[PDB]
């Protein structure tokens, strides 16, 4: 097979390639932070990195962070409007390879 | 040599790379934004966590929108040739696509553009990670019982 | 340790949890399609699923799709404005577990 | 029994689940949108690929914005109890957060909301995958030589 848009002589990559955005919450949603213990997302991210950085690929670590935040946390507020709310982190990957912090 | 697959980023450069933490806790009264209690706990946790991953952690507290851009620009102009990756953590108030400096907003795109594959050549082909703790809107998730 | 936002008696998960969006291109960018062979993204997604669905976790499959699109494709157009352009797919995960199509 | 970890979704239900493919190639002249040549190749490739993964593939061609919403609503109201997951592929013109029906736009949020954890209980806790081939803006990536 052959075409006009593949196998270029000069190899290039997108300027937007190899970026990963680890968002604390889903698009359009508030993000929660405990005034004493810190944000749910960062709390969880550090815990999962500390426990799995030398064992799992980054996307899998972030998936564990997603589960931790989603299942373990729920907001508390004297204002009914902001009480009993949930949060799900959002992994946005434009990475082109697996990422391991160890080698 | 034998079969080479290249399915994972080369992370054995002399340095793992930088981990820039922007920790905005106090905002100018003029903005009307409240202090972010507990953010120092996040910043410290991140410093320790990434320190153990061998990253060169650099922390900055309460930066204005101008200082945030200046910081990112300066860091992007450093020679990252011997670094395996780049990490930036943003802790502040925010909205979709925006992160707040102590005196106003900064478009996330403006921050990340400095690290584009064509603007930071020493990071081309290397993972650039942006960890963002900030709001992305005003929606609330009521959840569902499992 | 104890707090106001963790270990709820009634377990709940975010209503936005367990969603994965496999976007063909980065936020704000055009997406490319070959008028004859189909879109770069779908072409690549099917190829990677066909080759790795019984071997790799989904995020890792999508990462291979990211690399395939980013490295192998470049647009061709008689209009200089749309010629020689690149594309990087965008994985957006709100998943809470690893996903394997096999068991 | 022994140690149970639950790190992966249960994918051994009787059915893998549905794979809904919306293939919009021809648009109403009134919209001024051009035909999407080559999309049929994508639709066929997807049907074969997901068929081999054991998904119940259902294809729909040239749907109006009304038909897209009706389709998603109907599918979300089906009993997915014996299905491991849900897959939806959208092939059409689009912009950030929007997918085009043959006669107008449809907010992606409107489509995905039908499958929220609290609105489609038979899919709660199960992976819901949305594969989208469409534009998300007008930016062009000039790339960088490697």
Provide the CATH number for the domain around residue A61. 3.30.70.1470
Residue D67's Cβ-count burial label (10 Å; 0-12, 13-18, 19+) is middle
List of long-range contacts for D60-63, beta carbons under 8 Å, 24+ apart: D60/D20, D60/D21, D60/D22, D60/D23, D61/D23, D61/D24, D61/D25, D62/D23, D62/D24, D62/D25, D62/D26, D62/D27, D62/D102, D63/D22, D63/D24, D63/D101, D63/D102
Total number of domains constituting chain A: 1
CA distance B16 to B53: 8
Active-site residue D28, yes or no? Answer: no
HSE-CB for D104 with a 13 A CA cutoff: 6
The token pair at A45 is 């991210």
CATH (domain of B16): 3.40.50.1460
Interface probe with D: pick from B118, B123, B126, most Cβ of D within 10 Å = B118
Element (H, E) at B61: strand B56-61
Q: Nearest CA to CA, how far is A15 from chain C (Å)?
A: 8
Cα A84 to the center of its chain, rounded Å: 23
Q: What are chain A's partners, defined as 3 or more CB pairs within 8 angstroms?
A: B, C, D
Total number of domains constituting chain B: 1
Left if phi > 0, otherwise alpha if psi is -120 to 50, otherwise beta: which for C35?
A: alpha
CA distance D42 to C68: 16
Range of the domain at A40: 1-103
Contact D146 A11 (CB under 8 A): yes
In this structure, how many other beta carbons lie within 10 angstroms of the beta carbon of residue D121? 13
CB C35 within 8 A of CB D144: no
CB B34 within 8 A of CB B66: no
Nearest CA in chain A to B129: A20
The token pair at D98 is 């929007």
CA distance B103 to B80: 30
CB C18 within 8 A of CB D130: no
CB D104 within 8 A of CB D64: yes
Rg (CA), chain A: 19
Contact D11 C31 (CB under 8 A): no
Of the candidates C93, C41, C89, which has an alpha carbon nearest to the alpha carbon of residue A94? C89
DSSP string, A23-90: ESS-TTB---EETTTEEHHHHHHHHHHHHHTTTS-HHHHHHHHHHHHHHHB----SSGGGSS-B---E
Range of the domain at B53: 1-146
In this structure, how many other beta carbons lie within 10 angstroms of the beta carbon of residue A24? 30
- Beta-strand relationship, A38-39 and B15-23: unpaired
CA distance D110 to D73: 10
């Amino acid at each position: 097979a052959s075409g006009v848009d593949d196998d270029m002589a000069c190899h290039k990559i997108p300027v937007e390639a190899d970026f990963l955005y680890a968002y604390s919450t889903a698009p359009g949603y508030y993000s929660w932070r405990n005034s004493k213990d810190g944000s749910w997302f960062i709390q969880s991210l550090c815990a999962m990195l500390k426990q799995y950085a030398d064992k799992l690929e980054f996307m899998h670590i972030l998936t564990r962070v997603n589960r931790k935040v989603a299942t373990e946390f729920e907001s508390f507020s004297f204002d009914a409007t902001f009480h009993a709310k949930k949060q799900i982190p959002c992994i946005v990957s434009m990475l082109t390879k697996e990422l391991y912090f160890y080698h | 040599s034998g079969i080479s697959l290249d399915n994972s980023y080369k992370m054995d450069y002399p340095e793992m790379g930088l981990c820039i933490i922007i920790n905005n806790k106090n905002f100018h009264k003029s903005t009307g934004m409240t202090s972010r209690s507990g953010t120092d706990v996040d910043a410290a946790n991140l410093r320790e966590t990434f320190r153990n991953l061998k990253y060169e952690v650099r922390n900055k507290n309460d930066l204005t929108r101008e200082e945030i851009v200046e910081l990112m620009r300066d860091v992007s102009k450093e020679d990252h040739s011997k670094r395996s990756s780049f990490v930036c953590v943003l802790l502040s108030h925010g909205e979709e696509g925006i992160i707040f400096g102590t005196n106003g907003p900064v478009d996330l795109k403006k921050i990340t553009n400095f690290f584009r594959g064509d603007r930071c050549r020493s990071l081309t082909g290397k993972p650039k990670l942006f960890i963002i703790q900030a709001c992305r809107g005003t929606e609330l998730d009521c959840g569902i019982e499992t």
